[PDB]
Amino acid sequence: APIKVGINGFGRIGRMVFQAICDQGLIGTEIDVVAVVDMSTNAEYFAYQMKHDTVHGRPKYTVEAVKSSPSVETADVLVVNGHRIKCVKAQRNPADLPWGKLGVDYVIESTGLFTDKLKAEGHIKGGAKKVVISAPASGGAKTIVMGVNQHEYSPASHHVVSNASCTTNCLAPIVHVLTKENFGIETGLMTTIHSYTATQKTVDGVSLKDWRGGRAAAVNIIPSTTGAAKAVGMVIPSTKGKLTGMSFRVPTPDVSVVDLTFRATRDTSIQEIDKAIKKAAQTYMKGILGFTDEELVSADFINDNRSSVYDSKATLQNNLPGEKRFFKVVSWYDNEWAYSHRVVDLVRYMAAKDAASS
Amino acid sequence: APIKVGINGFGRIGRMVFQAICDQGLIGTEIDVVAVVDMSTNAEYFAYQMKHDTVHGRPKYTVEAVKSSPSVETADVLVVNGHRIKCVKAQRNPADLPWGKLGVDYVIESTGLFTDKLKAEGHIKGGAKKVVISAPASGGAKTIVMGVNQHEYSPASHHVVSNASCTTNCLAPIVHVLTKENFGIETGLMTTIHSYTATQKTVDGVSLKDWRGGRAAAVNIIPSTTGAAKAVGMVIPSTKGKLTGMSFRVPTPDVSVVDLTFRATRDTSIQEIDKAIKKAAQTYMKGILGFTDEELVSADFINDNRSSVYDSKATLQNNLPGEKRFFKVVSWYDNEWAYSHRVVDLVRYMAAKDAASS
Amino acid sequence: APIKVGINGFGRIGRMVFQAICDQGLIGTEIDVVAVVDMSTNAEYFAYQMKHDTVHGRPKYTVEAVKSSPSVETADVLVVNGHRIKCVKAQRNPADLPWGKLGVDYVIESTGLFTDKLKAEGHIKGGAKKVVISAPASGGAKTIVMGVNQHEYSPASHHVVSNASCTTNCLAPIVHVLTKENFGIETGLMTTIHSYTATQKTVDGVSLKDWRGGRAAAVNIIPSTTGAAKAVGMVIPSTKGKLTGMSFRVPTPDVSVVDLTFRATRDTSIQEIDKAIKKAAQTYMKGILGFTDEELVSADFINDNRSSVYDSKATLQNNLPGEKRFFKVVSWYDNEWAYSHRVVDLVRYMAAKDAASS
Amino acid sequence: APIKVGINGFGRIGRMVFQAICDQGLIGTEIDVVAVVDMSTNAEYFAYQMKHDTVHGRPKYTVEAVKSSPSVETADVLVVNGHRIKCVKAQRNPADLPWGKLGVDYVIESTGLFTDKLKAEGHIKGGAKKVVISAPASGGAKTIVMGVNQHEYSPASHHVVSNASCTTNCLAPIVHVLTKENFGIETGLMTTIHSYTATQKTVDGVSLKDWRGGRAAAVNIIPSTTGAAKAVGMVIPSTKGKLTGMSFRVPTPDVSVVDLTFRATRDTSIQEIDKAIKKAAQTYMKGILGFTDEELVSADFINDNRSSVYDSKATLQNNLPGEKRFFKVVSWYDNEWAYSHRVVDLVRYMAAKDAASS
Numbered sequence A, B, C, D: 001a002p003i004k005v006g007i008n009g010f011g012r013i014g015r016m017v018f019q020a021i022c023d024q025g026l027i028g029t030e031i032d033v034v035a036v037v038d039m040s041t042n043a044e045y046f047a048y049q050m051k052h053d054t055v056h057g058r059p060k061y062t063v064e065a066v067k068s069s070p071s072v073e074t075a076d077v078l079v080v081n082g083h084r085i086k087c088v089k090a091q092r093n094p095a096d097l098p099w100g101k102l103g104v105d106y107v108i109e110s111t112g113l114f115t116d117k118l119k120a121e122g123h124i125k126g127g128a129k130k131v132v133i134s135a136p137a138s139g140g141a142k143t144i145v146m147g148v149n150q151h152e153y154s155p156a157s158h159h160v161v162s163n164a165s166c167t168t169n170c171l172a173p174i175v176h177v178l179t180k181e182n183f184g185i186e187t188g189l190m191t192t193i194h195s196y197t198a199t200q201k202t203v204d205g206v207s208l209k210d211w212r213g214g215r216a217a218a219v220n221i222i223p224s225t226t227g228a229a230k231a232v233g234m235v236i237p238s239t240k241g242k243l244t245g246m247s248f249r250v251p252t253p254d255v256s257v258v259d260l261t262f263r264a265t266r267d268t269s270i271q272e273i274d275k276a277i278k279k280a281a282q283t284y285m286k287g288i289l290g291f292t293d294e295e296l297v298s299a300d301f302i303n304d305n306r307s308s309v310y311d312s313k314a315t316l317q318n319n320l321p322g323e324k325r326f327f328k329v330v331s332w333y334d335n336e337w338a339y340s341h342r343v344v345d346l347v348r349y350m351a352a353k354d355a356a357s358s
């Protein structure tokens, strides 16, 4: 019973999620990407945008652009591994989307302009059944971080779900094992060295909301705020008002690291922490949280689909020798690749549970 | 008789030109910047954008934002070295600009949205007397490159002048001397290694017009076309259909180089050419054309206001030892800085000429 | 009869070549890498360096480090897909190497310290049969370019061969067809936009031989000289004194592009040339010279083992509309990857022929 | 009574220090740089190196190379603002240096090969009176951080002094006011986002000591260790065993930032801390410690000679709303520029104090 999904906003995130679907070989069999919606319907451009990626390389599948009617001037259909995907024209209000007429049940909202529970619900008024916002949402939409609180998802109450942010999906797992393994977390501050994103500018440009963020991205270290910290609070209730962090945008196309600094509740050691994370990574967090014993650098995580991959050497080596409460944990993440796979995971999960509960 | 000027579009180019004026110490005395126009009138932001620049550093003048009336919520006035500059609200049609009302004669069109002779004339219909487009223009506007064909300016026939492109202001001078010194130029192809611009994307983004140009700028070598070559033909009649070139946008915030390859009309030597360029650079091209005997690198030309600075060493060392016709000439240019100083020069020239002829 | 090869110098070049072998699935079966030589024998480190590459990624094979005798403190043997590779200690003079005792017939010289025919012969006096220099050589060593003049290899006369430079292996193919297809080549100047290399400095450093080359590599456009052009003369005699070029080091970790400008012997067209290259790329040049009609960028050629991949769109779009003699041809190349495969190819070629002539 | 100083090792560090002398306009008048010592005495190359700096641009003084005698083949004397500086040939053992014969009293040890108290003392045996090492030193060499503990310099007891590291000169200040203002500091962990340095590599190279540090610097986020934390322990004894930190080398040629996360001894607020730092910056720390209310990015600190410049906004905006103990303070520093100025300051201080005590 192919999950009928539709992508709204075929940009970095959008394509990444689609590529995530194809990559896992779900296209056609498990998931049915009925269509993608964007300011353009030029299937040839998307084809080009999917066949070539500066950071992730070439896709393992074949992509081709075709016309729906020999009548049309430019291709408006995308064919991936045989499957046909319609390139729908973008709309102002989601409610004006032919989701219903297309048979789309799950809508992947990745335009970044409908991060509000209310506005996002327009997709349901357009014929959709469920909406996954590929970013942090407001308006009180249920936020889920695969591997930490998917079970809290209710097919009957939650219709607009948020997968949180790429950053949150790296911290939450760590924090989860930290609290689950009773290490406790009195308070904690986290710093994130992040790769520049699409919202940044190549040369000092305009940015009325984030002045610093409007400066030459590839040649500056740009500080910035991040709700990723507080956000972990919605996913892990016991951490509300206990966390907060900041971000440092630095000259790299992709892959970011997280430097979590926290104070435990009871005496403990960095080795105890180190072993727990690894243990958890080999058990209830396997697939979501991983680790490494090697001397790696950002590029070594490109295309790593774990939400958070703990740096053992970095952590063990940079903590006070005999400290018992004040600690620093380091974990990496491929902000683009990993988050993409999680989006898909959430959809499949939602789909399954939505079907089971009938 | 302060030149009443206005700036339409206060972005990279816009400010750059305004900073050039102040930098030259013309603000207030020689040139009077009555006001600037943009999608925002937040003088504070503008002050910020001017007091801080990733590539050029801190300005030599002081900048402060003030309120026209203590009644306004956010500053709307700029104050450079005493001179007050009004921050006007942008309009859809240049004609709807209070140029006459403000007493602005010369308008610097740097929005990039009115590069067409016709649309640009709107400023005049708006009360403006003259217009200098800070970019290549169409609609049959007089294109002028200081130090090459300014004399061809007619105070009564040319009302919308174009200062050409940053690149053309580099190749033009070289070609000019190459022709004037009777070296002759049968045909010629020019490659340009260019720093990425504001139109490029930090990460693989959208770009329907220039597909490659949409790819991550700071981490790729991106080929593109350039009218800079053919354009020299408008500035130097004898080169029509003789020149053409391409570009390669590379990972640098600013500073570009030109690799001109041509064939002479009569047997000569690279040594001859070398000496001619240098001679011209110390004479009729001084201020516009410069040269260097040092082993410089892109960075070394940052803030160099010459339109084009010939690379003697690079040139002498990379040509065929005994060649007499096929040659390669190399020259750098601070694509941002220099171009800006030329626009001002162009405005001061037209001004001085427009006045002289009464 | 597995070819007995040895690698002297295990740096970027060294490893790359080895990896090229493994990558081609020749390790153990076709080619037998008896041992590698370098200032260090820490197999663990080598393993690390092979398993993680910032530019090429993770290898398709398994690499592990082991000890020759449980007696040694640190691993001194590499195990690739089962095959055992010895980590010999480096020597001052190549003749002091146990090439004979080791059973090494073909020695890949990639230290860069023995680029001279004489010094290189040291290896043979050390027991080696043939020597292939992974760089341009002097002393009068036969220089070969796979796909252009390998047929000029004399098993009985050539005991020290040079696979030329990465840049040459890109130009030669193009120049080769251009001449074979009788387009003729009166003269020509080529410009190469090259990615920075290991010899360059991260920040302004010391470089008494190449002043420019000593400037911050990832933040500048650095000109330099290059025999790559004149060198094509040694592979293609008919072009001696006709070719020459320069280089521009730019902010990228890998992949370079060649911009060849030349004048033909007879009247022709850019289309003729475009078709001739593609045709050759699909026939006698397949494997060595490829092409592409896509809007690619540097990143798109990573791990492209073709010596030279002609850019059709770039070429066709940036030449004079009706030109008949002055043309520009653009071609990309993975200076690291491709060159590495050719070195391997050359060794196998020589091996096959050296074996055939008994 | 111009201070007689000599520079041993004229590289990045070497030159920066010298340039810092000239920049402050002390050359000839206040400080007499008698000569510099390096593996090369090519004044022309040093002249070049000082006249062109990628990150710091052109100098505010003139630099020319001359010959000690018309007989010498290549210049060996440096002339800055009329002052003559001798270029002496390097030696294995500092003690073989003609310091005494040249009349040098204060030697700035910046080769990076004599960071050990014992080895460095050779300079004195060579005729020198005092030695200032421009890096962290071992062997029990007094370490001073201008603005924090210069008063602990003993003319009669300390002959070999260390100016610590660029990073310590940024952390010490903050920590100093944090303790002096009685905010206390139970424990603290500092993370530093650092620009790549000269010890790093352009492309994946060799680094037996620091494996990750051997990876492509300009295209990776590379974690490393740093004694900068523990080092502040020697400068401010009250913090022994309380601090520690790690580093993140990122893709930038200069300018680093420190992220200090500490726990106060008594309840307070980030606003309290904020005000204290700002206050101290306008009083007893002026010149050493600075702050900023602006939305600045790394590039804005280029050529800022303050040891550490506190980021108010970044701080006030990224802490827990009502926290009273767990805090995060952010501060920048031009790792090259600043440190250089401090080295000079220390020398002057030592000189003044040495003189005073007769």
Ligand SMILES: COc1cc(OC)cc(C(=O)N[C@@H]2[C@H](O)[C@@H](CO)O[C@H]2n2cnc3c(N[C@@H]4CCCc5ccccc54)ncnc32)c1
Residues within 6 Å of the ligand: A008, A009, A010, A011, A012, A037, A038, A039, A040, A090, A091, A092, A110, A111, A112, A113, B206, B208
């Ligand atoms: C791929 O081709 C192009 C071409 C283009 O301009 C020519 C823009 C983009 C681009 O920005 N593309 C955006 C980018 O890829 C991503 C957001 O980061 O989503 C895309 N996007 C932007 N706006 C929308 C939208 N509705 C808007 C809501 C706001 C008002 C409005 C009014 C009329 C029509 C649509 C809309 N619906 C779906 N995807 C969107 C892409």
Ligand SMILES: COc1cc(OC)cc(C(=O)N[C@@H]2[C@H](O)[C@@H](CO)O[C@H]2n2cnc3c(N[C@@H]4CCCc5ccccc54)ncnc32)c1
Residues within 6 Å of the ligand: A206, A208, B008, B009, B010, B011, B012, B037, B038, B039, B040, B090, B091, B092, B110, B111, B112, B113
């Ligand atoms: C400084 O703060 C901001 C804020 C902002 O959005 C919130 C956009 C910009 C920005 O893009 N700023 C642009 C940028 O700096 C530069 C082009 O590269 O010109 C700026 N620019 C863009 N459009 C205009 C304009 N009129 C437009 C022409 C057609 C449409 C239209 C409709 C109603 C009213 C005006 C206009 N007039 C002057 N400068 C402009 C700057």
Ligand SMILES: COc1cc(OC)cc(C(=O)N[C@@H]2[C@H](O)[C@@H](CO)O[C@H]2n2cnc3c(N[C@@H]4CCCc5ccccc54)ncnc32)c1
Residues within 6 Å of the ligand: C008, C009, C010, C011, C012, C037, C038, C039, C040, C090, C091, C092, C110, C111, C112, C113, D206, D208
């Ligand atoms: C991988 O581990 C390390 C560790 C190291 O220092 C600790 C250096 C290197 C390194 O530079 N490694 C070099 C690098 O990987 C590559 C060149 O790009 O070749 C390596 N290399 C440099 N010199 C030699 C050499 N002989 C030299 C010729 C000159 C005189 C001399 C005297 C005594 C002993 C050896 C030699 N033989 C083999 N490989 C070499 C590698």
Ligand SMILES: COc1cc(OC)cc(C(=O)N[C@@H]2[C@H](O)[C@@H](CO)O[C@H]2n2cnc3c(N[C@@H]4CCCc5ccccc54)ncnc32)c1
Residues within 6 Å of the ligand: C206, C208, D008, D009, D010, D011, D012, D014, D037, D038, D039, D040, D090, D091, D092, D110, D111, D112, D113
């Ligand atoms: C500027 O031109 C050049 C040219 C050159 O080689 C041709 C090397 C350098 C260079 O490395 N330059 C180094 C670089 O600029 C800086 C370190 O960051 O210090 C330089 N440097 C390296 N070694 C020394 C030294 N003594 C060494 C100690 C080690 C053994 C030894 C043996 C005989 C004679 C001297 C020495 N004394 C002073 N500066 C040094 C610079």
